[PDB]
CSV table of C-alpha atoms in Angstrom, one decimal:
chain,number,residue,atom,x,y,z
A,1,UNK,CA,0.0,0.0,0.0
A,2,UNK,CA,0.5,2.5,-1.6
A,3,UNK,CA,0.5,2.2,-4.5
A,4,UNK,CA,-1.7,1.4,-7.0
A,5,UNK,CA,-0.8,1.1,-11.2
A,6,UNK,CA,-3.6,1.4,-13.7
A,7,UNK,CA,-3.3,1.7,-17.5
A,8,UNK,CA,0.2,3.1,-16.8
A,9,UNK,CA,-0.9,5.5,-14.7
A,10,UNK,CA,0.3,5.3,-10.6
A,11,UNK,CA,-1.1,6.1,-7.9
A,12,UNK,CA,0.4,6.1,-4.7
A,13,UNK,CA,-2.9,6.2,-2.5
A,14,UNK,CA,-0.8,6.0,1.1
């Protein structure tokens, strides 16, 4: 957690 990859785009939630 923390971090969360989607179509190439991250996302570092926490």
């Amino acid at each position: 957690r923390g971090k969360w990859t989607y179509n190439g785009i991250t996302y570092e939630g926490r």
